[PDB]
Structure 1
C-alpha cells in the first residue's frame, strides 16, 4: 500500500528535500509512520515503500488540500 505519505491534517503533498537523497525520506517516514519504514526522495516528494494497510497515501479522500 505504497506511495507518497500525506499530511494528515490538510492533505497537502508531503515535500521532501533535495531529490535523490533517500535519507530524509527514510528518516521522516521512520519517525512518524513507524520505526520500520523506508522510502526515497523523488522530485521534492517522499515516496515511502515499506508500509501497511493502515498507511494512507496522498491525498486524503475526504479532505484533500482544497
Structure 2
C-alpha cells in the first residue's frame, strides 16, 4: 500500500519543502522500520509506496495530529 509516513510518537506527518522527487522522503520511506520501496514529497509531506500492511500510514487510529 501507500500513503503518508506518520511519526509513531506524535502522529504527525514528516514534512518536506522540495516537492516531487525527494531523496529525503525516499530515504525515510526506505528505512527498514518503514519498509517502503520508494518515496517522494507530496503536498509538503513524505509519501511512501510499497509499504507493507504492517506499516502504519497517516493517520494513527489513536494518535491525533489534526
TM-score, with structure 2 as normaliser: 0.79
Cα distance in structure 1, aligned partners of 2:7 and 2:37: 17
How far the C-alpha of 1:41 sits from its partner, in A, is: 1.1
CA distance in 2, matches of 1:24, 1:14: 10
Gaps of 5+ in 2: none
Secondary structure in structure 2 of the residue aligned to 1:48:
strand
Mark the runs of 5 or more structure 1 residues left unpaired by the alignment. Answer: none
- TM-score under structure 1 normalisation? 0.79
How many aligned residue pairs are there?
Answer: 65
Partner of 1:27: 27
Coordinate RMSD, CA, aligned: 1.7
